[PDB]
Amino acid sequence: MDQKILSLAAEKTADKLQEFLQTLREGDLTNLLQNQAVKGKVAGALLRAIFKGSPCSEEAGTLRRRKIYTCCIQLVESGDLQKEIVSEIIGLLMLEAHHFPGPLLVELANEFISAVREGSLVNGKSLELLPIILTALATKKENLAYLSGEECKKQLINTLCSGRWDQQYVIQLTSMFKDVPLTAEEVEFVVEKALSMFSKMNLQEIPPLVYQLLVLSSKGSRKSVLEGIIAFFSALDKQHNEEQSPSGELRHVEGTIILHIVFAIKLDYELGRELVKHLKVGQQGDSNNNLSPFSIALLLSVTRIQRFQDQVLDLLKTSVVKSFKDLQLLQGSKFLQNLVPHRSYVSTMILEVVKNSVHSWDHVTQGLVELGFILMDSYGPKKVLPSLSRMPNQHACKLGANILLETFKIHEMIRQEILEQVLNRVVTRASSPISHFLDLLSNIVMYAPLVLQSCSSKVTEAFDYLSFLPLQTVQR
Amino acid sequence: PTMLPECFFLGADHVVKPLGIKLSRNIHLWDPENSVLQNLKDVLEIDFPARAILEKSDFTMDCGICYAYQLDGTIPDQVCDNSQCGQPFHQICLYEWLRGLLTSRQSFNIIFGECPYCSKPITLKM
Amino acid sequence: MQRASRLKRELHMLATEPPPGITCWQDKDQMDDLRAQILGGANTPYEKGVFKLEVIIPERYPFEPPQIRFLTPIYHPNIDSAGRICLDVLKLPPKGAWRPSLNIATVLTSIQLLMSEPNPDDPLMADISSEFKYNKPAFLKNARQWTEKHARQ
Ligand SMILES: [Zn+2]
Ligand SMILES: [Zn+2]
């Protein structure tokens, strides 16, 4: 049955192939089924023969093409073929998808819409063709009226977004919007649907989902992706703390999320700016409820980029300062203590972050070290070489101390450098108070000396300055 | 010799964890006048399995990757941070396995990845 | 090396306490490959047949998967004429599910399971798969014919 069509196609088009096409009208289904059963190259040859012998200038071939399109759509998912044949079919269809009018492609769009909504799509590979169809619709100036092809595209995509998706098939849904030419509200509704889909997901599924959400965020749609991820993980960690009132898994997630957000802002020097602008509590100075452990962890994994580093580390500092100012006013006043519910402070946030940092959070510690030392250097006692001036500064250095303490307790690759930094700031200055550093050091050594048999030589060489150092400090 | 020798543990991130925590808060109680074993029994606050099974294979102490003991003299030391697995592994076999794996992300000198038996987070420091 | 580590234990293990209806020895012709024999599972058309298989151990095997083939051919949806095994456990990560917690006995148990329960989702033989999907007795008939023709003495 095939070799006749091969011989008809061997020489010329639409003079004998059409004539034979008007002989065999039905049975293309079973024909293609035995075709894929025996050999798929024959199916490809038939498809080439069909699309050359069924041009769409004449409208009879358009319906043969629509029938065989639906045939391939159903079989490629349901009928488990070989892989190479499937790829070939998809490539051929994506090739010949351009030679159509508006409404035929609109009804193919509605086919796929109803199918992904309700049709248990066995493999979903057919969706690869869909964005080609949306492209052909956008570009085809054969105007419709229900109106332009791009506007019917807007309609169909608004339909799809407002509609329900599959749990399994959101990956591929957003993978399609990956390569489309979209506008602001297009990409907005795409990400909003994929966003609200988060509440019906296993957690091993979220990382590549957010990866693709962000590479699509690259178009214009940056702010809302991060704001939603933030609110999601905020409520998540609150719910997990209330459960405590899969912790290791939850940590493992948050880490790879932040890793992929790092690559993102690495590639986009603006993403971090909106991130910052979204987060900065000092709009005037009042505490926003935007920040969180995970939020902060993201910031500290970010600060190891060369541009935002100092910006972030200033922000966090001033925010902690405000935290403590409002807190000391609260505890100072009954009247306000009557009104406001206690809010998870920045300090305690950081401490819990450190607790979570134990697992695999290597990217965070490098900034935590700097952060603690920065607090201490910034607000260390310098005046004697008052609560409003001193409590913040003291609590600040105290917090830096707690950070470095609980850090040094558990992290085995930033020791020697916590250590030598303390020693460096201690030894040379020899003028400004370092009692804070020293008491810190005392606590450190006391808790866990045996580690310092490994961290040895810095102290042996630190003794070399002992002949030059001042006496009282040497005694301590 | 009775002075504190330099030491560390090999094993699990939940068994080795509180062992060092006791040691940190009892090393100050190290009385070098006693025997070392006697000092340990109170510093660590435990008794040893004093040859309690020594060299008798109950299949407990085995790599699970190479299924061997003393792989090139290398001991099953790396374990799972899991009550249910507690599957101990070598260094080299666990390294080479978590080498090809896609999820296996590499920090400075760390490889993270899933325990082969239980698919739980396991950390390897080279 | 770890190859031989796995191999020396799995040899004695599959010689003494193999899985049920499965046996395996060092292939007396090869001495690097292994000769396995899966006895025809009950409630199958493959009964009255001792299906021989060749088992290849790659050199990095606890890390690689094995490579099995049906030397005694089988009329199966998922096993082709040659005896290939389109099974995830013989495939690497996310494509497949191989890890050293599995081994020769586990994958042979999986193959024995497949011989009783063909996979309609991952077919090497799409036509035998459609036959097993719709026309059960024709598939079972052709499989029992295939068994008594080749697998029987
Ligand atoms: Zn080993
Ligand atoms: Zn485990």
Curated annotation (Swiss-Prot), chain B:
Outcome reported for the amino acid change (mutating F8A): Impairs interaction with FANCI and FANCD2
Free-text description of this protein's post-translational modifications in UniProt: The RING-type zinc finger domain is monoubiquitinated in the presence of UBE2T and UBE2W.
Effect on the protein upon substituting W97G: Abolishes interaction with UBE2T and ubiquitin ligase activity
Positions annotated to bind Zn(2+) 1: C63, C66, H90, C93
Coiled-coil ranges per UniProt: none
SS bond partners: none
Subcellular location, record wording: Cytoplasm; Nucleus
Binding site for Zn(2+) 2: C80, C85, C115, C118
Outcome of swapping L4A: Impairs interaction with FANCI and FANCD2
Effect of I65A: Loss of interaction with UBE2T
Zinc finger RING-type: from-to: 63-119
Superkingdom field: Eukaryota
Role according to the record: Ubiquitin ligase protein that mediates monoubiquitination of FANCD2 in the presence of UBE2T, a key step in the DNA damage pathway. Also mediates monoubiquitination of FANCI. May stimulate the ubiquitin release from UBE2W. May be required for proper primordial germ cell proliferation in the embryonic stage, whereas it is probably not needed for spermatogonial proliferation after birth.
Subunit note: Interacts with GGN. Belongs to the multisubunit FA complex composed of FANCA, FANCB, FANCC, FANCE, FANCF, FANCG, FANCL/PHF9 and FANCM. The complex is not found in FA patients. In complex with FANCF, FANCA and FANCG, but not with FANCC, nor FANCE, interacts with HES1; this interaction may be essential for the stability and nuclear localization of FA core complex proteins. Interacts with FANCI. Directly interacts (via the RING-type zinc finger) with UBE2T and UBE2W.
Disorder noted: Fanconi anemia complementation group L: A disorder affecting all bone marrow elements and resulting in anemia, leukopenia and thrombopenia. It is associated with cardiac, renal and limb malformations, dermal pigmentary changes, and a predisposition to the development of malignancies. At the cellular level it is associated with hypersensitivity to DNA-damaging agents, chromosomal instability (increased chromosome breakage) and defective DNA repair.
Domain remark in the UniProt entry: The UBC-RWD region (URD) region mediates interaction with FANCI and FANCD2.
Protein name stated in the entry: E3 ubiquitin-protein ligase FANCL
UniProtKB/Swiss-Prot annotation, chain C:
Outcome when changing R60E: Loss of FANCL-binding and of FANCL-dependent monoubiquitination of FANCD2
E.C. number(s) listed in UniProt: 2.3.2.23
Listed GO MF terms: ATP binding; chromatin binding; ubiquitin conjugating enzyme activity; ubiquitin protein ligase binding; ubiquitin-protein transferase activity
Active site per the UniProt annotation: C86
Effect of C86A: Loss of E2 enzyme activity
Keywords tagged on the record: ATP-binding, Disease variant, DNA damage, DNA repair, Fanconi anemia, Isopeptide bond, Nucleotide-binding, Nucleus, Phosphoprotein, Transferase, Ubl conjugation, Ubl conjugation pathway
Location(s), subcellular: Nucleus
Effect upon mutating S5R: No effect on FANCL-binding, nor on FANCL-dependent monoubiquitination of FANCD2
Catalyzed chemical reaction(s): S-ubiquitinyl-[E1 ubiquitin-activating enzyme]-L-cysteine + [E2 ubiquitin-conjugating enzyme]-L-cysteine = [E1 ubiquitin-activating enzyme]-L-cysteine + S-ubiquitinyl-[E2 ubiquitin-conjugating enzyme]-L-cysteine
Listed name of the protein: Ubiquitin-conjugating enzyme E2 T
Gene name tied to this protein: UBE2T
Residues of the whole record sequence present: 1 to 153 of 197
